[PDB]
Amino acid sequence: SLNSTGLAQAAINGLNARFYESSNARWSSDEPWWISGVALTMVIEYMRRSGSKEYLDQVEDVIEVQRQPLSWWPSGEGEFRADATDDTGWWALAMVRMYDLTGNEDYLNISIKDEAYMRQWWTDTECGGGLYVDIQDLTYKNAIANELYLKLVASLANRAPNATIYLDRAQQAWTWFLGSGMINGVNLINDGLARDSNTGSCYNNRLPVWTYNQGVILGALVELYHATKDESYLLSAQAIADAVLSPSNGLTSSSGVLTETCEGSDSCNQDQQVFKGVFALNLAELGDAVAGASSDPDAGQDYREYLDTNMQSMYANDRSEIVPTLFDSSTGDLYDVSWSGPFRNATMPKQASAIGLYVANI
């Protein structure tokens, strides 16, 4: 059979060999900055699950440089406070996992600063709650920025000293999210909310169902379950995951492979190329929590076999090994966007999603 730990290492090595920039402490500066934060999450989570510490020096290097005040948003004063609330949220959650891996309170302190910075754009006057994604414009309350923020306060409710205020915020944020309408009739989450012209009421904007908007919410509900031991949080998360796994909903192919809607038209952009790996790792979080909340041996078996099925398909159809030279000894694996499709090229967002699926099976 396949060993997920060794393949995640080969994928991380391929990510480093092709896309890591030593002089910048960052992967692929020609790609979105927030995807470097997702890549850091993948590498950190690989270490926690595999017990290795093989990239810890590299991770601390990336952290220390990306803490600095961003050149495109100096008013954030660094600590990953960017010009978008979801950009900040990706690095904030990576710092929660960095704290989980090392126990260094420094990384939890970043997460706390990030929560307070993100909360500045939570608003009760439009849509009765939720925060904006575009800090500069304040025109869009979308699913991903509010899912990241919800997972952040739910994580801090389990780790921070003033844990009670973060629990009240997480419980209040989930209540708003559930009543927002972004969760539709088949228990899937559209992209965000639109605002009525005359009335000012908000409603599901019916924009595409992206895989990473069905994943981050699972981790948030798992963290809310850990903070409350209320299994109804796991039940809501399971209904969202079951909808993704149902081939009738168009996200799981007839082969049982997770498929982004943009893969059909071959039009997945730099953002959408990383979505699947985010869902896979969050589904592994849901599976681990489900198996720990009951005594049935097959508890969470469907989520684990789904991750295994997607691993083997992408292992077999989406992989390409880098060829070593007389000068470069680097070895590893590269991956394209489609887990059940051909390998044409490899980009950093595609590679980061790749690692997330392997780490989800460790």
Ligand X SMILES: OC[C@H]1O[C@@H](O)[C@H](O)[C@@H](O)[C@@H]1O
CB of 292 to ligand X, least distance (A): 31
Q: Which of 142, 236, 238, 259 binds ligand X (CB under 6 A)?
A: 142
What is the rounded distance in angstroms from the CA atom of residue 215 to the CA atom of residue 332? Answer: 27
Which of 61, 271 has the CB closer to ligand X?
271
Residues 6 or more apart whose CB falls under 8 angstroms from that of 278 comprise 38, 211, 212, 215, 216, 353, 356
Chain positions 244 to 283 lying near ligand X, rule: CB under 6 A, are: 271-272
Using the contact rule CB under 6 A, the part of the chain among 7-15, 110-118, 186-194, 322-330 near ligand X is 186-194
SS3 335: strand
Q: Is 294 a binder of ligand X (CB under 6 A)?
A: no
DSSP state of 30: T
Distance CA 3, CA 7 (A): 7
Q: How far is the CB of 54 from ligand X (least distance, A)?
A: 27
Looking at the DSSP assignment, which residues form a beta bridge with residue 320?
A: 334
Q: Does 210 bind ligand X (CB under 6 A)?
A: yes
- Determine whether 80 is exposed, middle or buried from the number of CB atoms within 10 Å of its CB (0-12, 13-18, 19+): buried
Q: Which of 83, 288, 302, 308 binds ligand X (CB under 6 A)?
A: 83
Residues 34-63: x where in contact with ligand X by CB under 6 A, - otherwise, as a string: ------------------------------
- 192 touching ligand X, by CB under 6 A: yes
Q: Which one among 144, 227, 258, 357 touches ligand X, defined by CB under 6 A? A: 144
Of residues 140, 151, 180, 139, the one with CA closest to residue 88: 151
CA–CA separation, 86 vs 333, rounded Å? 29
Residues 24 and 61: their CA atoms lie apart, in Å, by 9
- Tell me the C-alpha distance between 141 and 86, whole Å: 11
Applying CB under 6 A, the span of 16-24, 140-148, 226-234, 342-350 interacting with ligand X comes to 140-148
191 in contact with ligand X (CB under 6 A): yes
30 vs 124 by CB, closer to ligand X: 30
Which runs of E-coded beta strand occur in the chain?
20-21, 26-27, 193-195, 202-204, 319-321, 333-335
Nearest CB to ligand X, comparing residues 142 and 180? 142
Return the percent helix, strand and coil in the chain, to nearest 5: 55, 10, 35
Footprint on residues 60-79 left by ligand X (CB under 6 A): 72
Residue selected from 17, 18, 32, 119 as contacting ligand X according to rule CB under 6 A: 32
Minimum CB separation from ligand X for residue 70, in Å? Answer: 8
Asked whether the beta carbons of 251 and 242 are under 8 A apart, the reply is no
Which amino acid is residue 101, in one-letter code?
Answer: L
Which one of the spans 139-147, 215-223, 291-299, 304-312 is the region binding ligand X (CB under 6 A)? 139-147
In whole angstroms, how close is the CB of 188 to ligand X at the nearest point? 13
- Minimum Å distance from CB 88 to ligand X? 12
| 133 touching ligand X, by CB under 6 A | yes
Q: Return the number of the residue (287 or 349) whose C-beta is nearest ligand X.
A: 349
Q: How many residues touch ligand X (CB under 6 A)?
A: 16
> Which sign, positive or negative, has the C-alpha torsion 281, 286, 292, 294?
negative
Using the minimum distance from each CB to ligand X, give the nearer residue, 33 or 335. 33
Residues that bind ligand X (CB under 6 A): 32-33, 72, 83, 133, 139-140, 142, 144, 191-192, 194, 205, 210, 271-272
